[PDB]
Amino acid sequence: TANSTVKVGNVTFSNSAPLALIAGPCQMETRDHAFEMAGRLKEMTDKLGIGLVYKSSFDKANIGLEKALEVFSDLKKEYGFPVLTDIHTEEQCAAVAPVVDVLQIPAFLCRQTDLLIAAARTGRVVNVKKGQFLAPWDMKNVLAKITESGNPNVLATERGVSFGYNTLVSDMRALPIMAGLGAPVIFDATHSVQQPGQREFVETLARAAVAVGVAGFFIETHEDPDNAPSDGPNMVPIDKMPALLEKLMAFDRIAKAL
């Protein structure tokens, strides 16, 4: 019993609506860097008519919460977008909820029922990253922990499944399956390509997903991914983002008429 349209600040997520973007660097760095990344993402999405949710993690985990919340607060004041971050404990959900619009359950924690309930109880939008060890239908039971806990605003993010050793595959059937559960479906293009333990296939997977039909994309991006503090091999260079997004929007226009 999820909301099929999830509205967060100025952003609408729905399998029927134009694509929305969750984007940002993996890890929050300096305040300088945060404002540069968020400014560039806001400009390119403003021009395209794409809603933006700005993302960054503060726990490292495989800047710290206090500092990060200050930066997130100032970003929101300057740019007006909702923000997202990942949470790892019940105490972290309560601590970030005053500022952060969308709480994210990491893939490794997607089965941790008490964390799903704690996120749910904040009344924030909850994005659940589907674990690479889950099947698409398994998400019914995961998302239910949130919706049956009284929070109807859930997003389900596809991020690939384990395929042998050191390989993920993206089963495009996950998208209609999860959409059938009633929550907006988000496609994580950057983690879906990774070699557990690849950037050349981000566009490939993104094009496939948008044509199938998704509410949104989750794309990690950075100005110099090879030199980034975390997750660097996977992130799209920020200067390549406008071209990617323009392409995705062309397909989305067709996909969302059918």
Place this chain on the structure above:
Amino acid sequence: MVTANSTVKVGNVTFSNSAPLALIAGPCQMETRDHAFEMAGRLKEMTDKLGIGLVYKSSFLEKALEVFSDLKKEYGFPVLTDIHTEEQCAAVAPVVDVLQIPAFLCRQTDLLIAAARTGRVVNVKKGQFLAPWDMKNVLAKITESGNPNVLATERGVSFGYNTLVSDMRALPIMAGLGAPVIFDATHSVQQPGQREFVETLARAAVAVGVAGFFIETHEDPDNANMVPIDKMPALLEKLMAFDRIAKAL
């Protein structure tokens, strides 16, 4: 020496990962002569309206080759059928434009060589036990035999038990081998040992970029897996809209 053609011309059809999508379509098995002309006429009608190339396919031999020959006289399209032995390649080659290597036989060198030596276009279905880069050495058996006209068909890869998965990365990787890549929508959804997901996989594949689509279709697929023929015009129209974008990028 000899290398795969990135553009493969078959009769009045052009396959290339840079050209508009062409269609390989038909029933699994040839039934009757009348059934063949019906399916083919319906397929040609829809492909004529959309402006897409059609290769008509069926699996069978004497009677079948006469049916194929007559279909070609009447409709002017090329045809495709599966071959299983060296002897079969030789028998069907005077009539059939595309010889198809089934996925279970994609590593059978002697068959690959026989089909190559006929001079026909050879379509190899990628085994569900192969990785996309494994098609390099498969395609090389045809091209090193002197035949540059090869098509590589994606049809899914084994994913745990009784499950296939469509890794869309297979498409650019195989395209990189230098042959047109064909997406088999109807076998890629199979539950080994699902028709609902055929549109899903097809939309994904076309947005990634393919030379063509391979779809098994029938007027009554429950009494024949297959896309009902009455679902083809809507599906194809959607796939052509995505293709136009995919091929311009």
Place this chain on the structure above:
Amino acid sequence: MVTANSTVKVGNVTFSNSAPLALIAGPCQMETRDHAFEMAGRLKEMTDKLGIGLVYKSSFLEKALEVFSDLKKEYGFPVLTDIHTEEQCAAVAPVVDVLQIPAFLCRQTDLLIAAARTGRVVNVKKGQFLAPWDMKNVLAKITESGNPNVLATERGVSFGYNTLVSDMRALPIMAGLGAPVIFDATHSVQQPGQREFVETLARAAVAVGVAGFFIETHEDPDNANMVPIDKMPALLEKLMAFDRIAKAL
């Protein structure tokens, strides 16, 4: 610098891929104090007769640590429990001999470091998303933190959907990393999202060669997955017979 110990001594138990098998066993969750002493007594009885080391395990904290402490006073064995946060490591360490990292947390560096810094033995369950060689970098987070006493537990790897598979090659590969390898028979048969195959997988693992077996067990597993406790003596006797051969070769 610091490297994993190929022999890990825990209280009166020795773990090594060259030593006789030792047993890590107990219920999933600690129930009551009386239930704990019962399970433990039954396990110690059977391990005493067979001459095998026993580490008693349970998941929970204040009451639980008092139970563990009393079990140790009475039975003299080491104990193991799962930890989920840094704070938890610190709280359980004064009592619990082996800190266990659950499979879902095996990549959580901060937790790995916290458990390492306690000076206790750390057992890391291999994530079902990891390859066996991926345990190199996991184990290194504990050893580079100054703790050489690590156990590596095999518990299956994802195999398509809702299925795990036990790749017996994981065992020598992980042994090659230099830590004793533990086989989790009860989680390796899991259907994510099967008790019949626990003996099958255990027999295979022991013939390959493992430092130990991890088995969840209960007196009434339907009202608690788990091996019924009354099935343990027969299973263990079989596994010891294979172990003797495996360890001499």
Place this chain on the structure above:
Amino acid sequence: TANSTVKVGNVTFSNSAPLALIAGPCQMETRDHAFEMAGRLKEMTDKLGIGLVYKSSFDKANIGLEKALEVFSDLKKEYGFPVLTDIHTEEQCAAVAPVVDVLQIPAFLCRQTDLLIAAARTGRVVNVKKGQFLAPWDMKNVLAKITESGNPNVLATERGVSFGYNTLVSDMRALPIMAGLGAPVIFDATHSVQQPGQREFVETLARAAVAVGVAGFFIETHEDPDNAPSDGPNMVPIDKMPALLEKLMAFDRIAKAL
């Protein structure tokens, strides 16, 4: 409705009986080479009390039938063992059946119903290699094509399943599952380790399988596997075979009492 004991010449296959060995080089080479391999295999199995079925292929396929049948006939005359070879067409089953005791259906052909029926109709023992794309329970339907065709003497050979790309895994649960179908189960140690498109793990997998319980082993072997005409990376050096087999028999003695 398979025979739970399959007797072929001097060899007994049963999940209850001491292990039997199917062994030989992948491809038949010279007559010299055939007699050397078969002699060495007969000597080492004679000493251990292990029944031997000598194997070689004549079709190449990813010496030729006429020559191979002559060699097989002379081997049988000299050594007295049953022999095995793989068949690929209905005509090949009829052509080799006069001489060959055990017809083998290759993994890639295990779903080809007409070939299963043709092998069955020869009245020879049929060994079916389980395809790497099959599940253990799928073998019920495969083996049924033989037994329902009137031939109750079938062997089911485990040879690994596809695990991501260029990797096989050996699911040891396949062994009790297939045994539950009633046919003797054979473990192919050499193909189960291979990298599709490894010898150091032949003993690992073999030890696992024998402890679980199997009727037999299928082991490809050659005097100089690195220089062999086919399948060389996978085959056990013939001089390592006695030590391997001695180890397997030690475990088998325990496994077959339980």
